[PDB]
Design a protein around this nucleic acid. Sequence first.
DNA 1: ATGATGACGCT
DNA 2: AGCGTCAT
Length: 430
Amino acid sequence: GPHMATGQDRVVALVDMDCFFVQVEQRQNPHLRNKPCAVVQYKSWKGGGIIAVSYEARAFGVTRSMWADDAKKLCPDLLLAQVRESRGKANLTKYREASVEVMEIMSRFAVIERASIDEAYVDLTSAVQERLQKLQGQPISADLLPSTYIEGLPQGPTVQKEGMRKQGLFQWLDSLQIDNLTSPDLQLTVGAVIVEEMRAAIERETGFQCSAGISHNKVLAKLACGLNKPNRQTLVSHGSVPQLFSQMPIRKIRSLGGKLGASVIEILGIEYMGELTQFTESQLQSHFGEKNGSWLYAMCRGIEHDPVKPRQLPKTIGCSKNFPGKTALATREQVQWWLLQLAQELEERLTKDRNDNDRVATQLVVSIRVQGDKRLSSLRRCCALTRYDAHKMSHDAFTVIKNCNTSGIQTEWSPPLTMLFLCATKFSAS
DNA sequence: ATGATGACGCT
DNA sequence: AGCGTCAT
Ligand SMILES: Cc1cn([C@H]2C[C@H](O)[C@@H](COP(=O)(O)NP(=O)(O)OP(=O)(O)O)O2)c(=O)[nH]c1=O
Ligand SMILES: [Mg+2]
Ligand SMILES: [Mg+2]
């Protein structure tokens, strides 16, 4: 009890842009706003692959990874925006630039870790301290939390969705201990006021809406984010964890959505995150390894220590294209041509990066998939990246992969390539 | 024929 | 180094 750490030491948020590529296209084209719409890449095979979906289209069953032609059977009035195509591949520059717009705004409030093109974690611990002093010991108005849900409330002795939100919020704030500058629940609340302000700023300055989770660590912040979407934010307190976890499938917790999560379920014969509390740390470590067992033991109690890394910029800059089915690359000249295309996009991105962010990449990773392999990558090789020159980079990547060709006739490439990937890495200051 | 990315762990 | 996992 008096020596048990409760993982209540930080305030962490996760901010996630709602249907982000869709919002980028809707800002640009007002005819798409407030409509069922999706973002598609390519167009020939089955209308293109959907990669993002507006909340109005999701109500019809439209999802990512559906073909647009199939999405149209569920939602006949679905509007589509197409990803730009440059040098015969998808080019995500518009979405990268929009993400930078958002991240720069977030960075005014606190330390951010870029988690993906449209998510960042935020460490609010310091911001909350500072804000607790100036606000003094005076109370926090619900009007400062207009889009916040307090997970697990209301509870105890209304018919509308906004009404439930306000009821829980009132219960929370009515129990808050406002004169104890170290109360975790108070710290979270202030964190949430800050996140409201951050979200208001993003929307005002970009037009983009997002959801957010506020809790004591990244895993709980991420989970919290997804609980009330879109355009809302959710506070998951330490106290809320036992009930929340008691029915929370294991696969919903970040890092457990794959093979390890499935093994936890199979080996232990459990279904929900809270059920982990029944095992000793050594038991868990015995099944899953020292690092994973320790992490699971703390996580199922709501405790997690992964720091929010101060990193707003990606650490690698890469370009790839899949060549599925009949388009698989089968001649030396095709392979070379496509490496050049990839290397030209890459050069463009790298030069821009070098001007914007004062750094230079030094390693080039070359990855390919071959026809028949159900892995992301059949093969990865590195080479020095000494000049930002597309012809050099493509020539080098070719060199590095060329003996993968089993074909006897030199013009041909067997087995055919179903993926090419160039990745610039090992950045240094410039 | 679920694409184009990106981070990190294991050995 | 190069492969495997998990994620958006
Ligand atoms: C998961 C995922 C996302 N994305 C892009 C499209 C989304 O617009 C953007 C953000 O991903 P997300 O946060 O997973 N999804 P979303 O932002 O579209 O939707 P949500 O509102 O966050 O659910 O990333 C992909 O291109 N491929 C993916 O597999
Ligand atoms: Mg999102
Ligand atoms: Mg996201």
